[PDB]
């Protein structure tokens, strides 16, 4: 699919007065590559993968400056939003932002997005056209109004169409070894004589990249997918992901059941039994 460059900002107000915790994380596709946290003294934007270390000092200095200024911005924003909702200064609140860009086939912006949320719920969002805003309530309409009068959508759109896509292409080039590779899942079926004369078959897919995958159990003689126990896709800890799907069959029907695995790292869908 199309490659992605995404940023996730979390600002958490504290009842202990004035500051707020600010955390920023940056992803290329499903690979985290930078982080920022204002909790530690002398805080810096820091690498989280080897390839981004190819960048020089000036890069890290500029990124650190920008995220620190953004942090102070979100600190002020928490108080502004608290005011809008007529909430007390007693409780802690959160302001989240996700933004980023997808690379099209011509090396240009395919889709760009920017979205802000207050205490877990949609606050304001930039529209597909990248020129207008969707406020989710009346408090956000004040923000929508301010932004509309200051042509904020223009700068957001010029960032997404310009700097974002070019740095995404740059990052795809710096880590082409690992970023442009699809890693297929290592699959296997384990058998557990567990239930009362019922056999649990569990189909495992391990170490696949990117996130998206399809795991189903099919029964010879029926077309739809069979009911199963399916856990959510989970990180392996090394940048890959894993998943499994299990079901219990009578203790004689082991090879009447097939696990089907669909992943973009596989040349063709996979069948295990």
């Amino acid at each position: 699919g199309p490659h992605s460059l995404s940023y996730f900002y979390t600002a958490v107000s504290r009842p202990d007065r004035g500051d707020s915790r600010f955390i920023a994380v940056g992803y290329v596709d499903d690979t985290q590559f930078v982080r920022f946290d204002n909790y530690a003294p002398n805080p810096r934007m820091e690498p989280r993968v080897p390839w981004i270390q190819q960048e020089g000092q000036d890069y890290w200095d500029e990124e650190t400056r920008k995220v620190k200024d953004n942090a102070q911005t979100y600190g002020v924003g928490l108080n502004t939003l608290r005011g809008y909702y007529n909430q007390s200064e007693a409780g802690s609140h959160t302001l989240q932002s996700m933004f980023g860009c997808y690379l099209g086939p011509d090396g240009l912006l395919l889709h760009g997005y920017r979205q802000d949320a207050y205490d877990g719920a949609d606050y304001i969002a930039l529209n597909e056209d990248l020129r207008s805003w969707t406020a989710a309530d009346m408090a956000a309409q004040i923000t929508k109004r301010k932004w509309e009068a200051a042509n904020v959508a223009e700068r957001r759109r010029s960032y997404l169409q310009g700097l974002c896509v070019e740095s995404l292409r740059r990052y795809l080039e710096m880590g082409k070894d690992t970023l442009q590779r699809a890693e297929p899942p290592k699959t296997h079926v384990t058998r557990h004589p567990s239930s009362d004369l019922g056999v649990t078959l569990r189909c495992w897919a391990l170490g696949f990249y990117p996130k998206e995958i399809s795991l189903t159990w099919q029964r010879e003689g029926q077309d739809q997918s069979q009911d199963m126990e399916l856990v959510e896709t989970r990180p392996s800890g090394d940048g890959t992901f894993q998943k499994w799907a299990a079901l219990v069959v009578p203790p004689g029907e082991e090879q009447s059941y097939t696990c089907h695995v669909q992943h973009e790292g596989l040349q063709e869908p996979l069948t295990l039994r």
């Binding site: 990124e63 920008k66 911005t73 002020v76 924003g77 939003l81 933004f99 700068r155 740095s167």
Partner: peptide
């Protein structure tokens, strides 16, 4: 070159 340089923001 990666984060939006926000200046004139503290503007919600």
């Amino acid at each position: 070159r990666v984060e939006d340089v926000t200046n004139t923001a503290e503007y919600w």
